[PDB]
Design a protein around this nucleic acid. Structure first.
Ligand SMILES: [Zn+2]
Ligand SMILES: [Zn+2]
Lengths: 63, 25, 127, 98, 81, 223
RNA sequence: GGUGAAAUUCUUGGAUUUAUUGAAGACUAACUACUGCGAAAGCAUUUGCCAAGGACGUUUUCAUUAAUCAAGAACGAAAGUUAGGGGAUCGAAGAUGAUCAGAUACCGUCGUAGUCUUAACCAUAAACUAUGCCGACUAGGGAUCGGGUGGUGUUUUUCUUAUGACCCACUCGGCACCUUACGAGAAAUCAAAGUCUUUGGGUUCUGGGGGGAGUAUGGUCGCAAGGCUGAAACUUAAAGGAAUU
């Protein structure tokens, strides 16, 4: 379970079936300054650094 | 107008139906 | 070198099938498939069921060696649920990242040219 | 009273229409009055375009935007939260915002 | 509106109007001198012949059936009456 | 158990079976598309018997190279054994259900027609056709609707071209007319005066009946 | 199989699945739309035949020829009825597991028969656009289907205008819509409910508080089912429509 760490440059806005995924823009520090966003939920601000698993992922709407 | 007493009327006309049936049959 | 086929994914709202089928058109392998593994009796059609079935498919593929197939993402059709639910996505994705040869994803949802009337009486279901 | 001039149907010169069934509950409904929907939707989630694009021979397969048609009796069409209710003085506008 | 003078309306009013609705009733369409390439059968045919009118002398059928206004069959010269 | 056996391991298909090879009609670049497996070809009910006659859907971009041979698929018929190979005869061609579903959009009509025609050979073939209302270069009429008499004129026209082509030649040359969609171009140029009529295409060519043995083409496909 | 979750299934004598071929019947989804056609019930594929019909064309003719209309007739959604015909995942009652405080409301499986055709009834409905049918006059816009009226318009070039195709200017006819009244209205709202105490263009109708009750009783139509016409006595001072809190 490779672990990587990310910070949000700008929060986007909650969305989901009933509030599913907390949009947390994962600037995984090894490839910081990018806009790739992955599966994150939780309380949200900007300034924290948390854990993301995959370095590279894509996604459409979480229907 | 209120259809709840109309549902009463529906039911009781089914009643008249069975009763006139029993007499006439 | 390559041999192609169709995995014949069969996505319902319950217990989605998988069956490797070469382009011979009538040749599946090991009917024992996803109707076996997630024995929670309501996870038969869950994304985890799909992904696990997909590792089963990758293993089956390698032990039979046909690296390639084609993709018919399928609904139940008839008079019910002509849009496959979740019971297809994870199996596809894990098969894709499971060392196979992808090709020709397509839609065989059989919308009938106006066949029989649907089921449930005029009023239908209640909720 | 007089709520929806079209009776929420939009035929207004007709007076019979062949029925149409649901697909979430399998309930009938008049066609024009009903709420069905077209889905020009992606064949696969773009949470897969990378892997699928790579492990595909004949590089750059078309990636077809599949279509479909769902049929909802207004029951399912508000139970599954498609159409959102409004007021009177706002209901009038028809042109969907997206 | 709110003032007008309709007794002798300007011609464009009628031109933009339909008969049977004008001020002074009148029709639109009119006759035509059909002139055949052959013998100079200087004939008269109305603009809506409605029927297979033919030249008297030579069988050079002139006005084909139409929806409305006649159609000269590409050979005759017409003189508006 | 939950899966019940009221009563009222499986190993090694591979050795208990064998592969056999696609052998496409000569009009295709590749005389092979894929493999099949089948019971070991021991006589006394040779499974090669329960091999002849099968059908297979394949890609024509695959057997003629160019990708634009994509959204049609060709059905081929298994005919007879050549040993490790199967020279398949032609059986038909359709769109891919997705693409045909794709061209159907709103605010334009469809125009459909059917026909059934015989051939130079004795192979009775049913053929269909679809077409649609073009929207003129300067066209603003969002509708683009095709009034009925126009429909019937165009439909008949299609029937005459197809009749002029089918009942006139052999199977492989029919495929050759098909793959270039020359028939398409004939239709377009003939019909363009009637109505703009774009997305004109064909489809769904199917077999009905053939004479009993006809070893002729079944052996002439290859030497 | 299932929503919030179970029973009932054949088979290791073969199965929910895989394709390969045979038969009934329903209906033409997608395009199928604030879009057609009819009197209204309705009617969706393609074709032939049969007539019918409307609308527009009209420098044809008949010369008040008519509009509605108790009596009388025709059609008449779906249900049912008689017989015959067909007999399939799409079915009232009846079986059938749990939700079972109680399921003979829900809900899954099995499912007669109406579901369909032919011969006859049957004559209702949320047959409501809840706006009877004519016809006469008035407000502004745009779209749209069937016609035509012009335009060197454009493209296809059968072709030059146009008739194919469109485009733009004018209409006349089909379902309408959005601003909208000063005028209505009790109001929600009005393209008819406009032109109404500043009361009358003409006709066919139907009802005077609610129940009792469209009930009883007579006729009458039908084989019943059933309608059609259908009162009181007694009881009661409110039922009730819109609209706001
Ligand atoms: Zn529904
Ligand atoms: Zn002459």
């Amino acid at each position: 379970t490779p672990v990587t760490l990310a910070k949000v440059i700008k929060v986007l806005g909650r969305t989901g079936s009933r509030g599913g995924v907390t949009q947390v823009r994962v600037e995984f520090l090894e490839d910081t300054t990018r806009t790739i966003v992955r599966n994150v939920k939780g309380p949200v601000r900007e300034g924290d650094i948390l854990v993301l698993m995959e370095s590279e992922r894509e996604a459409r709407r979480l229907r | 107008m209120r259809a709840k007493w109309r549902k009463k009327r529906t039911r009781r006309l089914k009643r008249k139906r069975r009763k006139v049936r029993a007499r006439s049959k | 070198s390559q041999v192609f086929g169709v995995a014949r994914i069969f996505a319902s709202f319950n217990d989605t099938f998988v069956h490797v089928t070469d382009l011979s058109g009538r040749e599946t392998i090991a009917r024992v498939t996803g109707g076996m593994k997630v024995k929670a009796d309501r996870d038969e059609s869950s994304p985890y069921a799909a992904m696990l079935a997909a590792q089963d498919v990758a293993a089956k593929c390698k032990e039979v060696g046909i690296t390639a197939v084609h993709i018919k993402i399928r609904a139940t059709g008839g008079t019910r649920s002509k849009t496959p639910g979740p019971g297809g996505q994870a199996a596809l994705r894990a098969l894709a990242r499971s060392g196979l040869r992808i090709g020709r994803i397509e839609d065989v949802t059989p919308v009938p040219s106006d066949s029989t009337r649907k089921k449930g009486g005029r009023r239908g279901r209640r909720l | 009273p007089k709520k929806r001039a079209s009776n929420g149907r939009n035929k207004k010169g007709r007076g019979h229409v062949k029925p149409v069934r649901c697909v979430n509950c399998s309930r009938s409904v008049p066609k024009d009055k009903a709420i069905k929907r077209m889905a020009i939707r992606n064949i696969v989630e773009a949470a897969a375009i990378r892997d699928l694009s790579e492990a595909s021979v004949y590089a750059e397969y078309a990636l077809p935007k599949t279509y479909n048609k769902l049929h909802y009796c207004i029951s399912c069409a508000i139970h599954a939260r498609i159409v959102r209710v409004r007021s009177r003085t706002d209901r009038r506008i028809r042109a969907p915002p997206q | 509106v709110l003032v007008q003078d309709l007794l002798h309306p300007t011609a464009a009013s009628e031109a933009r109007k339909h008969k049977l609705k004008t001020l002074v009733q009148s029709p639109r369409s009119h006759f035509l001198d059909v002139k055949c390439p052959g013998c100079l059968n200087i004939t008269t045919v109305f603009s809506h012949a409605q029927t297979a009118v033919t030249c008297e002398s030579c069988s050079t059928v002139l006005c084909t059936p139409t929806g409305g206004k006649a159609k000269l069959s590409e050979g005759t010269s017409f003189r508006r009456k | 158990a939950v899966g019940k056996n009221k009563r009222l391991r499986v190993v090694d298909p591979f050795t208990r079976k064998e592969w056999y090879d696609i052998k496409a009609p000569s009009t295709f670049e590749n005389r092979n598309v894929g493999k099949t497996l089948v019971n070991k070809s021991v006589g006394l009910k040779n499974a090669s018997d329960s091999l002849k006659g099968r059908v297979v859907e394949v890609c024509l971009a695959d057997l003629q190279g160019s990708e634009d041979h994509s959204f049609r698929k060709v059905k081929l018929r298994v005919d007879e054994v050549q040993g490790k190979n199967l020279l398949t005869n032609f059986h038909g061609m359709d769109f891919t259900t997705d693409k045909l579903r794709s061209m159907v959009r709103k605010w334009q009509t469809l125009i459909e027609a059917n026909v059934t025609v015989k051939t130079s050979d004795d192979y009775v073939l049913r053929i269909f056709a679809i077409a649609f209302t073009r929207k003129q270069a300067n066209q603003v009429k969002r509708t683009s609707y095709a009034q009925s008499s126009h429909i019937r004129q165009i439909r008949k026209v299609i029937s005459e071209i197809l009749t002029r082509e089918v009942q006139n030649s052999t199977l492989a040359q029919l495929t050759s007319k098909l793959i270039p969609e020359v028939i398409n171009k004939e239709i377009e140029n003939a019909t363009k005066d009637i109505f703009p009529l774009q997305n004109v295409h064909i489809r769904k060519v199917k077999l009905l009946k053939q004479p009993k043995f006809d070893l002729g083409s079944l052996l002439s496909l290859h030497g």
